[PDB]
Amino acid sequence: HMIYAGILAGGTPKQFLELGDRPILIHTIEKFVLEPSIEKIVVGVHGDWVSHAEDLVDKYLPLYKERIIITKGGADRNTSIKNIIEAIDAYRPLTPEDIVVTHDSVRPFITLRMIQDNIQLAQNHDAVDTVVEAVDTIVESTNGQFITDIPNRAHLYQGQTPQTFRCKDFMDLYGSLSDEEKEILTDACKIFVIKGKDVALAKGEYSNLKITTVTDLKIAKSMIE
Amino acid sequence: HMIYAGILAGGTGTLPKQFLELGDRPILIHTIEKFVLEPSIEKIVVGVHGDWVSHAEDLVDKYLPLYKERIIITKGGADRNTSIKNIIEAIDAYRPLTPEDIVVTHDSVRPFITLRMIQDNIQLAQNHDAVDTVVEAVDTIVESTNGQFITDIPNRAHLYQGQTPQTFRCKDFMDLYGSLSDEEKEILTDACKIFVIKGKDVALAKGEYSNLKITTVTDLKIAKSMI
Ligand SMILES: Nc1ccn([C@H]2O[C@H](COP(=O)(O)OP(=O)(O)O)[C@@H](O)[C@@H]2O)c(=O)n1
Ligand SMILES: Nc1ccn([C@H]2O[C@H](COP(=O)(O)OP(=O)(O)O)[C@@H](O)[C@@H]2O)c(=O)n1
Ligand SMILES: [Ca+2]
């Protein structure tokens, strides 16, 4: 079986911002290029930014242009995955056993260690979520007016990426959902859980920051001196 | 009836940052300054560690000279609940508690609280049991009861990050903290968690993503850039 990388960069964007010296997207793709087991690295880019992602690849990673496929992502992260898996299928026809390690372009501090656990866990599980023990106190409210519930904070995890699973599996489970369900089931791991599937946990790092806000940008800058 | 600010501002065992310089003033000072903005808050009761009581007194004498008779320094407890107990009992020494007297509890290490947040807490406390300043979770929260594979990914749209202010009536909190045993108090160290699990109507207050909790070093670095 093959292993692929699925970089999600189709968002609406922070990943084309310079971090230190190079775009966050380039930082993120970098960690995947060394990994011997990863066949191609496939990036879902917003259809408008595709060409600008390739100029970026040429300018910043000319040694790996062959290892990278830049493809049009979709309206929401799940769709981007669909599109990434489709592009994988265009490179080599998917077998039941081929794998995708998906990851946010805006997470530029993922470690080869994480990547390797995800790949490694996926052997004897349906899918793999990368998480860390929750820091904030989490409060629930179905209405958004008063507290409907407070979950037990000793079993809560802050969810990050990689999210790793077989390709066919995603195309099957995601495929079988009405639009209304897709709109509610936005997390890729959620879909596996509700379909009653075994999703194991990969140890993430509190440092696996996801860069969404101008505050996240500062935290990142201080992490690279 | 009365309105008090209860500033949870002391303890060890966890190096907590409330006495560090932010811009020019210690963080705690920034925090107290927000509550002096509110004309309606009677006194501002600050709950510091035993060793730090006088250090805090001086900080008021040095940085808040005029609003010094507005502020009352007191000893904290082992946990913030024991501290709220101590803040409450300090107020009862100042002015005997009237069943409706509310306390606006707040982390001393959250100096970016606005008056808007404060006023929403006094207001929402009117016809609710308690108030919890809150913001929409930005992170997907994942539940796992076993610890190796997931048992639940709640809907994120319905999930919230806890902040402070947390507001309530003084007698109301004491009467619940009482019925709890010494081993019972351990399992639920947050104040709003007591109200909910003893079935009470505690409403949400729109918080702020800028309402940072200064705990780590990078947190201090973010904070310094914000002011
Ligand atoms: N259609 C989409 C939407 C978002 N994304 C984004 O997914 C990652 C970050 O997720 P997000 O915070 O935008 O959304 P979510 O919180 O993961 O649902 C980014 O690396 C990427 O920009 C994507 O690749 N394709
Ligand atoms: N007995 C205690 C213990 C800690 N605290 C802490 O509660 C406030 C915010 O919490 P923190 O940032 O120290 O973090 P933690 O809640 O102690 O994990 C601090 O101002 C103070 O150090 C308290 O008010 N009373
Ligand atoms: Ca009443």
Could you walk me through the main structural features you see in this protein, from its secondary elements to its overall organization?
2 copies of one chain form a homodimer. The longest helix of chain A has 15 residues, at 77-91. In chain A, strand 2 and strand 3 (22-23) form a beta hairpin. Chain A starts with a strand and ends with a helix. Chain A has one domain (1-225): Spore Coat Polysaccharide Biosynthesis Protein SpsA, Chain A. In chain A, the strands form 2 sheets. A 7-stranded mixed β-sheet of chain A has the order 5-4-1-6-9-7-10, sandwiched between helices. In chain A, strands 2-3 form a two-stranded antiparallel ribbon. The first copy, chain A, has 8 helices and 10 strands. With 225 residues, chain A is α/β, with parallel strands linked by helices. At the A-B interface, strand 8, strand 9, helix 7, strand 10 and helix 8 of A face strand 8, strand 9, helix 7, strand 10 and helix 8 of B. The structure holds the ligand Nc1ccn([C@H]2O[C@H](COP(=O)(O)OP(=O)(O)O)[C@@H](O)[C@@H]2O)c(=O)n1 (2 copies) and calcium ion (CA). The site of one ligand CDF has 20 residues of chain B, from helix 3. One ligand CDF binds next to helix 3 of chain B.
Small molecules (ligands, ions, cofactors) in the structure:
the ligand Nc1ccn([C@H]2O[C@H](COP(=O)(O)OP(=O)(O)O)[C@@H](O)[C@@H]2O)c(=O)n1, calcium ion
Strand order across the biggest sheet of chain A? 5-4-1-6-9-7-10
Secondary-structure element pattern of chain A, one letter each: EEEHEHEHEHEEEHHHEH
Oligomer: homodimer
Alpha plus pi helix count of chain A: 8
Number of distinct beta strands of chain A: 10
CATH top level of chain A is Alpha Beta
- By CATH, the architecture of chain A is named Alpha-Beta Complex
What fold name stands as the CATH topology of chain A? Answer: Spore Coat Polysaccharide Biosynthesis Protein SpsA, Chain A
Percentage of residues in strands of chain A = 15-25%
Principal-axis shape of chain A: globular
Q: How many domains of chain A? A: 1
> At the fourth CATH level, what is the homologous superfamily of chain A?
Spore Coat Polysaccharide Biosynthesis Protein SpsA, Chain A
Radius of gyration of chain A: 17 Å
Largest sheet of chain A: 7 strands, mixed
**What separation lies between the terminal Cα atoms of chain A?**
40 Å
Main interface pair? A-B, 41 and 41 residues
